[PDB]
Structures are given as C-alpha cells and as structure tokens.
C-alpha cells in the first residue's frame, strides 16, 4: 500500500519490503505524536522528490501503535524513530538524526549512498577540498578501479567526519613529492600534512587516519569541547595551566613533547585555570586555582573514572611515564577527598570525608546514618537543621551514629550519589549492609526508621 509515495509497512509485509529495496528509509511513528504530524508532509515530499529523480532510495512508514512487536524488534522507544536499511540488513539499521525538512532527508540519504570519495579532476578541486575542512583525505590512484583504490574507497565510506577526494591527474600527484599511487591526509594544524606509509588496505588506512586526524595538544573551550567529546577517544588527559604561571610556554611544550608518544590513544588537553569561564570544570575536579597547574586523566567508558599522577613534576618524562603506568593498569583510580577536620567527631553529627568514610560508616559495632549533601543545594540547607536535631537526639546512643559528607568535594567507592540529599544507613555488621532511606525527611520519620532497625 502506498500513501503519497511512502510505502505502508506492517509485520506481514516488512521482510518482503526490505528484500525488495536495496535502500529503504523507515519511519516508526504514532498518529498522536506532534512531531510525527509535522514530519508526515515533509516525509511524503522527500519520497516524491526521490521518485521524480528515479532514485533507488525508497521511503516507508510503520505505525508503532498497530505494529508494536515490529517496533519492539528495532528498540523503538520514541517517535518519530527513523531507521535506514541498506541491502536489507536488519541487524545494523542506521538511525537518522538530521533535520526535519524534506531537503535534509534527501541530502542525508544521498550523502550516505553516494561516492565515498569525490573525484578531483585538477589541483584547484583538490585545494578547495583541503580548504573546506580542518582535516581532508586525498587518494592518488592512476587507476580508480585498481584494488588499492577500492580499499581506499572502503576506508572513505567508513569515515563521515573527514571529506574524501580521489584523483588520477598527474599534476595533482606532482603537487608535492608524489611520484606514484598513494594516500595523503591534509590538516590545518601541526605539520599540515601526513603521507600514508605501507600496504593500501582498509584497516591500515583507518589506523593511520585515526592516529593522525587529531592535533597534538588541544585548548579546552566551548568551541573545541564538541570535537573532543564527540570523538571515539575514551581516554583524555587534562593540564590545568594558569596564564599567570611562570614559563607558561615551556611547561606547555613539555606537555606537547609527552603527547607525541600517545597519538591516537590518549587525547592531550590544556585549559586556562585563571579564567572564570573554566571554573565549572575546576570545581568538577574539586580543584582550586592555587592547586594549579595540575594534571588529571579520565576514562569516559560509561563510568567516568579519574586518575592523578603520584608526582606533580610536570616534565615531558613524568607525563609520559604517568600515561604508560595508566595504560599498564598500574595506577589506582583517584577518588576525591577533603582534609579530615580536626573536630570531625567533636559534634553530635560526625563529619565524614573520603579518607575516613570507610572505617566510620562500615564499623561492625555501629549503626551509622549518613547524609550525603551539597552546600549549594536548597533542599539540603532545609534538611540541615533536622539532621542536627537528629544528631543531638542520638549523641549519647551506644551504637547509633549520625553523620554527614559533602558529596561535591568527596567521592567514595562504596556509595555513588547523584541526587541531593541522599540518605543511607549502614547497620552494625561486617557484611557491609546498606539501606537506602526513601521516607519523609522529618525528625519523626528518621526516628521510626532507626528504631525499626532500618525496616520502616
């Protein structure tokens, strides 16, 4: 069934439609969704345009309110969810995330199905390509149908962030030093150009590009952040370097020298710690401007884990040795912890930091109730007088301990807090029992809970 050149798909005809069309875009929609109502005329307009051009690309729709099992099979949780199917492959459909206009749809489809590398007839077309992007890759092949040219085109179709070019013109080769077939990466930073060395395979090309597409040391700004964190490099190293520091250039050069050893593996970033715009990042690491310059390393693999060098000697050798020890699994994760106050236990409410949390909260002889708070949190400020009154009530209790920890400046391995205030109870035991308090934040509620042995 076809409505305005869009194929109407159901669980009964879906497999037939995927087998019939090499290039099929499928919209999973719901008739009550505002976004789907707005998309429908643009989706039909894009389908009509592709049909008028004689394109093999076809557009289709699935009503997820009637075809629930079919939508579930493709993990559809929102509407519209748009997925592109190539060669009838149902295992890896590509999600469409680009603009809502008919032209964005048509352009997205043509950009993915089109030529992996743009044919460059001359040196002016090649310069225009290199100037159009911060990084551009050009394949120099006398025969575009050669097996090396095909492996280059397979590497070109796997990379979307870098524009690719392909040339057979001898002038373009001669431009700078190319005598025979080869691949060249161009960039607007560092050496400006990298020549491919080795056998021309898809794997060797992608590994070479991955290693040389990133600049050595990057300045952290709101403009560079999306490029750094949009990237597949899940290991980063940050140098907080105040512009007021003595020998700024020399210390930055030591960081650059170390970075040469980890190209493509660890991304090197520096940031001005004196600037007010960079304050949130300093605060995220529990760092003060007086503690700068400092170096931190982070892994972004789902659980963001931080690492810090044992030595704060910021030489090219020490930065290289720290990176190697990290890669060797020889450095333990850094969990933030404030200095333990001299009077931490003097008050009815005990003060905890990362350093003493474990031996206090997990004391087998004590029933410890801990408030994990943030100093700026309004709801924590309102809870504070109730918590102080709870501490004052149980101050002389044989086994009950009331405690608090600033979770903005202290991180602990046993408990991870992402809302404030979070209240957790640690009953008197050596099996590390933890009971989360989800009741009303009243002195009455806390008493019932403590007196019930954490049950109520």
């Amino acid at each position: 069934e076809e409505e305005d050149h869009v194929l109407v798909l159901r669980k009964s005809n879906f497999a037939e439609a995927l087998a019939a069309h090499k290039y099929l875009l499928v919209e999973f929609y719901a008739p009550w969704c505002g976004h789907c109502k707005a998309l429908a005329p643009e989706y039909a307009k894009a389908a009509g345009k592709l049909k008028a051009e004689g394109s093999e690309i076809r557009l289709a729709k699935v009503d997820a309110t009637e075809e629930s099992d079919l939508a579930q099979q493709y993990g559809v949780r929102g509407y519209p969810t748009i997925k592109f199917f190539r060669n009838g492959d149902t295992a890896s459909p590509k999600e469409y995330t680009a603009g809502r206009e008919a032209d964005d749809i048509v352009n997205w489809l043509k950009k993915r199905t089109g030529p992996a590398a743009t044919t460059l007839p001359d040196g002016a077309a090649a310069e225009s390509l290199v100037e159009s992007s911060e990084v551009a890759v050009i394949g120099f092949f006398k025969d575009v149908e050669s097996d090396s040219a095909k492996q280059f085109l397979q590497a070109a179709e796997a990379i979307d962030d870098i524009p690719f070019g392909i040339t057979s013109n001898s002038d373009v080769f001669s431009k700078y030093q190319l005598d025979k077939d080869g691949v060249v990466l161009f960039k607007k930073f560092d050496e400006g150009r990298n020549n491919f060395e080795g056998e021309v395979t898809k794997e060797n090309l992608l590994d070479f590009i991955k290693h040389n597409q990133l600049p050595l040391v990057i300045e952290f700004t709101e403009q560079t952040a999306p490029k750094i964190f949009g990237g597949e490099i899940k290991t980063h190293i940050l140098l907080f370097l105040p512009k007021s520091v003595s020998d700024y250039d020399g210390k930055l050069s030591n960081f650059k020298t170390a970075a040469e050893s980890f190209k493509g593996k660890i991304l090197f970033i520096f940031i001005d710690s004196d600037h007010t715009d960079n304050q949130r990042i300093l605060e995220f690491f529990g760092l003060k401007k007086e503690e700068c310059p400092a170096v931190r390393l982070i892994t972004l693999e789902e659980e963001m884990t931080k690492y810090k060098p044992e030595s704060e000697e910021l030489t090219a050798e020490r930065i290289t040795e720290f990176c190697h020890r990290f890669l060797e699994g020889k450095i333990k994760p850094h969990l933030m912890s404030q200095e333990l106050p001299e009077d931490w236990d003097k008050q009815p409410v005990k003060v905890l930091v990362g350093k003493n949390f474990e031996d206090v909260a997990f004391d087998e002889k004590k029933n410890v109730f801990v408030e994990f708070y943030a100093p700026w949190c309004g709801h924590c400020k309102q809870l504070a007088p109730i918590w102080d009154k709870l501490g004052e009530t149980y101050k002389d209790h044989e086994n009950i301990v009331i405690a608090k920890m600033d979770s903005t400046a202290n991180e602990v391995e046993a408990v991870k807090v992402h809302s404030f205030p979070t209240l957790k109870f640690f009953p008197a035991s050596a099996d590390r029992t933890v009971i989360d308090y989800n009741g009303e934040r009243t002195l009455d509620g806390f008493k019932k809970f403590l007196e019930s042995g954490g049950q109520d």
Binding site: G78, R100, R280
Partner: protein, 237 residues
Amino acid sequence: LPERDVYESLCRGEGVKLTPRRQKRLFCRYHHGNRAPQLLIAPFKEEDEWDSPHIVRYYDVMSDEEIERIKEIAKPKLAVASYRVSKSSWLEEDDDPVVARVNRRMQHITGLTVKTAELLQVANYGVGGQYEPHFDFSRNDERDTFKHLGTGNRVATFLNYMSDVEAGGATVFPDLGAAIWPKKGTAVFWYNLLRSGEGDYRTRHAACPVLVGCKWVSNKWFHERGQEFLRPCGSTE
C-alpha cells in the same frame, strides 16, 4: 473569586507548603545536559523546584558582567491603555557576542536547539499593576505570532533572573500552589508541552507584582520544530 485569594496568598509566600511526601521527591543534581559534550566535564548545578510537572532551577547561568552587558543593550530598546506596568525588548545575536553566548549556553543546558527558538526577550518590571495567569503555549484555535513563524508552539520556557528584587516578584503557578522566587544569575526551566506535543495544562502561571525593587528578567522560548530528534515522543501521553 477564591482565585485572586489563591494568587495573592501565593505571592505573599503563604498558601501550599509542600507535604513531606511531595518534598521527598525534590533533589539537587549536577546536570550532565543529557550528555552534552561541554557539560560532561563542566556540569551545571540543577535544583528541583517542583516534581510534577518538573520545574528546575539552574545556578550560575550568567555572571554579573554578562547581566550588565545585556541590560545595557536592552535599556534603550525597552522604552488602548496598559494596566500591567513593565517594559520589554528582543535581542539579536549580532547585538553582542554575549547574546550569542547565552543562547548557546541555554542550548547546552536544555538539550534543545535555539535555531527555532524566539529572540532573547529582556523584560524590566515596575512596582505594581497585575500580571494575569496564562499558558505560555498559545491556543492552536488562535491566529497569533506562531503560525507566521512556522516553528510550532512554545515547547519550553527558560526564565533567567537578572536582578535581586528586594521583595515580591515571584512566578506563581495557581493550579500547583507553587511559587518560584527570584534569585539573580539563576534560571528556571519547565516544559509547556507534553512528550506528545499537546499542551500541559498544569503549567498555568502568572507573575506576582514587584513590591520593592526592580525585577530584570530574560526569557527564552523554545519552539517544538527542530526538537523532533532532541525530545522524541513517549507512548500514549
């Protein structure tokens, strides 16, 4: 009129005091910006002002220098009889890089695009008058300032507080019994439309008149168009 009574009692800080059952659902968090790259290493502080609908306050959204610069651009552009006593202006990104920087900051925080959003509205409020309860999403039966834009209805409101008000000036939600108090440099954010695109009628709100001081505020209204991929639909409602 036990409507004016409710409005005025909320303006005076009286009315509904949250039950410990409602209060136990409100928290503070470091906002990741729905994994916006910038905010992964520099998250903003977010605090829940209401649990349903979700009304949040973001801290440190603007510095005093950004605020003053915006006020300087706005002041000249600020200034049937009009009983409500206030002035307003609309700012373009080309006026100063500060306007472009705040718009981009709001996009990072909300996860919504500013490409289809309205200009940064700057409003100054004078002591007195009365601001009536209304819905920011205008009715689709009306021929207003939304069909000509072709960007759809206002999906969300981002209210920045640009001044310390000595007394008064809260933003009150009569149907919720919620009053949101001015705090210079902070912003309050809520969605005007549900996941479905239909209007959230719980978000009926009004501004309390300023009692002592001058309330400076800047609003950014996001429209539904362009947010299809940023805020997808959720099954039934």
